[PDB]
Amino acid sequence: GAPATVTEQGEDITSKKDRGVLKIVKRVGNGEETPMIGDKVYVHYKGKLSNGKKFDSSHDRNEPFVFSLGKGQVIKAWDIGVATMKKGEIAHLLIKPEYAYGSAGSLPKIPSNATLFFEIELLDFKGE
Numbered sequence: 183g184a185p186a187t188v189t190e191q192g193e194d195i196t197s198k199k200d201r202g203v204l205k206i207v208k209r210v211g212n213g214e215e216t217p218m219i220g221d222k223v224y225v226h227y228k229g230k231l232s233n234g235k236k237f238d239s240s241h242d243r244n245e246p247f248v249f250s251l252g253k254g255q256v257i258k259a260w261d262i263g264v265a266t267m268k269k270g271e272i273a274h275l276l277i278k279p280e281y282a283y284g285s286a287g288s289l290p291k292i293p294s295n296a297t298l299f300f301e302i303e304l305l306d307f308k309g310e
């Protein structure tokens with residue numbers, strides 16, 4: 183399925199090239215510009231654990247998730263990954279725990295040492 187495919191066919195987007203965050207572009211977005219640090223980013227997403235459970239979805243809430251890029255309001259992989267996306271892009275990310283919730287996990291949804299899968303759509307980015 184999609185998690186296996188990004189695991190086996192994704193590209194390393196980390197600065198360290200430690201394969202901690204792999205990406206596949208599913209739908210090419212608009213032009214060349216990606217958001218900058220401090221932008222208010224609006225995304226839709228779905229997240230799955232390695233046991234197949236969908237642990238979250240903005241679609242299911244009928245509202246986008248909004249955060250300020252690059253300010254550590256989200257897991258490291260999101261700040262890294264969303265920063266690579268164009269407006270309108272849909273991407274898959276496969277994230278090792280060192281770029282997500284590590285040995286702690288995040289109670290109750292995320293276990294310790296969890297590799298995470300996301301599908302993310304960048305809706306809009308604005309501001310700083």
Ligand SMILES: C=C[C@H]1CN(Cc2ccccn2)C(=O)[C@@H]2CCC[C@H]1N2[S@](=N)(=O)c1cc(Cl)cc(Cl)c1
Pocket residue numbers: 229237238247255256257260288289291292
């Ligand atoms: C809508 C909540 C976000 C939570 N965070 C930041 C955060 C804030 C507080 C505690 C744990 N993580 C995040 O960094 C990431 C990435 C952006 C979407 C989503 N999460 S998430 N991984 O989907 C998620 C989803 C759910 Cl239902 C619970 C948790 Cl603990 C984490």
